[PDB]
Design a protein around this ligand. Structure first.
Ligand SMILES: Nc1ncnc2c1ncn2[C@@H]1O[C@H](COP(=O)(O)OC(=O)CCCC[C@@H]2SC[C@@H]3NC(=O)N[C@@H]32)[C@@H](O)[C@@H]1O
Length: 294
């Protein structure tokens, strides 16, 4: 299916004149095209087509000092890199990529991205193991919607035009620190190409991944620090409400045991969804449970 060494030699998106990095050049290139990577040829020069201008690692570093950045055009998953490199990291160090050969959703699912058309990054984070991470996904989602001026959806979705603008994937590292060690994965659609999807280019055609990435991370980190102090406090619930695309709406709540319906009533102190069902407020925990507008 894929010659990883090719692509990797091609990942600089630069005009290479037919050096061999293989056994079936036309085959693997068409196989790379079948995966979906775009490879244009002009006579004898081959070139991998970034959907957007490649990022510049040195600029991210200086823009995000003292946090350390690992940049890598092609990767399996920026989450995997944080996991495999956890010992060398401090709170807030990041991995950034252009394309993921195995981008992870929740629960075995996949994350799709064309080459260089997303903001894809993961980072290490850590809490006191006594402190609860109830609501963490809400904090991440809100921080991004505050930067991009878009809307959130419980528990972790980023929304423009009621369309999926990106994904958030919090994973727990089995690392022995005396701390709770997270890797936090974020994908934000910028310029793409199942369900309809949103991309930042719709809203601001002059978006630049190079300066939006540090803007996202600076606010994300800030929102997180506020969360270590205040949790899902009443300021948060108000900030949430203002960005909540489903505030006080008639919704369907999809759990493993079926559908329950009602009117959304925001969130409680643990980040649980609050829903007026019949005559009581019922609460739900974000794992797997999904939300839909009636
Ligand atoms: N680019 C996209 N935009 C919107 N929806 C997508 C999409 N690609 C796939 N989907 C659909 O979104 C579903 C998964 O939604 P979930 O809530 O289960 O899973 C997520 O939404 C979290 C995925 C987060 C991606 C970033 S990318 C870098 C860090 N490194 C990783 O590997 N992941 C994080 C997929 O099964 C659907 O096909």
């Amino acid at each position: 299916m894929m010659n990883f060494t090719l692509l990797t030699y091609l990942a600089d998106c630069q005009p290479k004149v037919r050096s061999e990095l293989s056994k079936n050049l036309e085959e693997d290139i068409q196989q790379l095209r079948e995966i979906g990577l775009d490879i244009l040829v002009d006579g004898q020069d081959y070139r991998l087509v970034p959907m957007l201008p490649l990022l510049n690692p040195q600029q991210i570093s200086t823009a995000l000092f003292p946090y350390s950045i690992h940049y890598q055009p092609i990767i399996s998953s920026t989450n995997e890199w944080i996991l495999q490199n956890i010992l060398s990291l401090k709170k807030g160090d990041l991995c950034v990529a252009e394309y993921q050969t195995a981008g992870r959703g929740r629960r075995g699912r996949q994350w799709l991205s064309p080459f260089a058309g997303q903001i894809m990054f993961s980072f290490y984070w850590a809490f006191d193991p006594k402190k609860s991470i109830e609501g963490l996904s809400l904090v991440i989602g809100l921080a991004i919607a505050e930067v991009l001026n878009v809307q959130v959806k419980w528990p972790n979705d980023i929304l423009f035009d009621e369309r999926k603008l990106g994904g958030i994937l919090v994973e727990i590292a089995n690392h022995k620190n005396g701390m709770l060690n997270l890797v936090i994965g974020i994908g934000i659609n910028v310029s793409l190409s199942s369900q309809p999807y949103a991309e930042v280019c719709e809203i601001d055609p002059d978006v630049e991944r190079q300066t939006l990435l540090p803007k996202l991370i600076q606010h994300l980190y800030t929102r997180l620090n506020i969360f270590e102090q205040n949790g899902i406090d009443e300021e948060f619930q108000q900030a949430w409400q203002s960005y909540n695309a489903f505030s006080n709406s008639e919704i369907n709540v999809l759990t493993e045991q079926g559908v329950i319906s009602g009117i959304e009533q925001g969130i409680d102190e643990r980040g649980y969804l609050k829903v007026l069902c019949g005559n009581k407020i019922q609460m739900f925990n974000g794992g797997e449970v999904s939300l839909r507008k009636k």
